[model samples]
Target: PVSGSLEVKVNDWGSGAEYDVTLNLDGQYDWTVKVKLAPGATVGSFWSANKQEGNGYVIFTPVSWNKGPTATFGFIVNGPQGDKVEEITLEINGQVI
Candidate 1:
């Protein structure tokens, strides 16, 4: 929902990375998460709470309260170089929430 806590975490696999983002939703509402990887990074796969597909970003409207207080979204990304550095920016509704 609009008023909740969002927590972001990442797992670096040397050549690739995995991101797990969680939301402690306080109400029933819609939400969108926008993620942009560093220019040389690529997304292998992604999913939301119920295995919902995700790309660079995910737009979840009317996120169900049935999911409880915690819902998570995840992604698998890889960088261009086999063992190099990478970065990403995450935002919600045009703000870093």
Candidate 2:
């Protein structure tokens, strides 16, 4: 199963440098995000082990979906991967549905 998520923060200016990103699997995660920014637009991150044990994920920000329909956001990943896996692609359609 493979799924992802996104969020928006308008007028965001890191004052005290406060930022947190996580994906929750019904009380299964509090995955603290870690990012390393380079001089380019491309960014990268590696999931903290304390977040998901068997599951690991990363976000490629501002992934444009459609050129005809323009969109913007962070990113998301449901679970690792499996055929027998159920809803490993955790949806963000209201309440991690």
Candidate 3:
């Protein structure tokens, strides 16, 4: 059986609307995650104070497995305009069973 897990952490700079997510999985591909900020947010906005915002960042850690392990992580940012910026990460562990 294959499965995945996610962890989320949030911080407040002005409006905590931005949520940071981390994904851990067992599958097959090199994963990448992203988060897109809202209207008040941007690649050069206040929330991006920590790093270059484009969407968001990827924080993935593989679990126990024979191979290096593979999985996917997607970072989704819900903006004010009912917009969603989504990023995905993949790893080569098990097939898409």
Q: Which ranges in model 2 have alpha carbons more than 4 Å from their true place?
A: 8-15, 22-32, 37-97
Instruction: List model 3 lDDT by residue over 12-69, tens digit each.
Output: 4442234554555554434333343445443323221123343344333323331224
Best by TM-score: 1
State the displacement of the C-alpha of residue 75, model 1, in Å, after optimal TM-score superposition: 0.7
TM-score of 3: 0.35
- Model 1: runs farther than 4 Å from truth? 49-68, 81-96
lDDT of 2 by residue, 76-96 (tens): 222222211112222332223
Per-residue lDDT of model 1, residues 26-69, tens digit only: 64334555554554666677665333334433333223542435
TM-score, predicted candidate 1 vs. hidden true structure: 0.60
Report the C-alpha displacement of residue 39, candidate 3, in angstroms.
Answer: 0.7
Against the true structure, what is each candidate's TM-score? 0.60, 0.21, 0.35
Query: What overall lDDT goes with each candidate model?
Result: 0.55, 0.26, 0.38
Q: Which stretches of candidate 3 lie above 4 Å from their native place? A: 15-20, 44-97
Per-candidate clashes, comma-separated: 0, 4, 18
